[PDB]
Amino acid sequence: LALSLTADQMVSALLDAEPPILYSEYDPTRPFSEASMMGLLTNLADRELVHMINWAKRVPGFVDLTLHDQVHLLECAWLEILMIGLVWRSMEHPGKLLFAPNLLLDRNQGKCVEGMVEIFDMLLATSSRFRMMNLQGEEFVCLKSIILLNSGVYTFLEEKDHIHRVLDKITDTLIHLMAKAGLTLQQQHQRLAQLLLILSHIRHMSNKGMEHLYSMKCKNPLSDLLLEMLDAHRL
């Protein structure tokens, strides 16, 4: 099914399936309470999750999977996908994280929540990296879909082979894009490697973020769907 797609069709499919940039209910007339700032962030992430789930269903090859497996992959990658989306939105805003068009924060405001500033800086450093690499949207949608299909395969048969087949297709797509920008093979491989190493950092941010949310849980907001994703990684 999705194995029959060409590289340009792969990109188009991924671009057309992009989720929208949602808005925060952020009122600039309540200068920060940890409960309120967390509330704003929680409300936003929960609405973003709903779109991600319908986004995942449009990722080439994801539909060819069974439940259990689609649930598993999302339970593993959801925070990675939210984070790489946040980072990507923030590319043209140095030293700032664009959670929503009306909600743009720096690391100072990230200190409003206990222990959130650490993850903030990591998110900012990631964005600075993408800006430095001049990451492209065509590359972004490939990475995000790579995260969806890869983050969970190593914790599950005959389905993995299909996933790796799709994963190999996305790899071909990235190379196809880089060759189109007049890169050279050497730089193609190099950029490909550089992009994929960022995912390791994104995994690390997600793991730390996952710990942080489990912390705010037994501290007492949190949506029902968010807690459901949060128990997937337990505590």
């Binding site: 789930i53 995942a56 439940l67 689609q70 649930v71 459901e228 994703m229």
Partner: peptide
């Protein structure tokens, strides 16, 4: 399971 239902629609 909410995620289950949203994936099933």
């Amino acid at each position: 399971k909410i995620l289950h239902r949203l994936l099933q629609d």
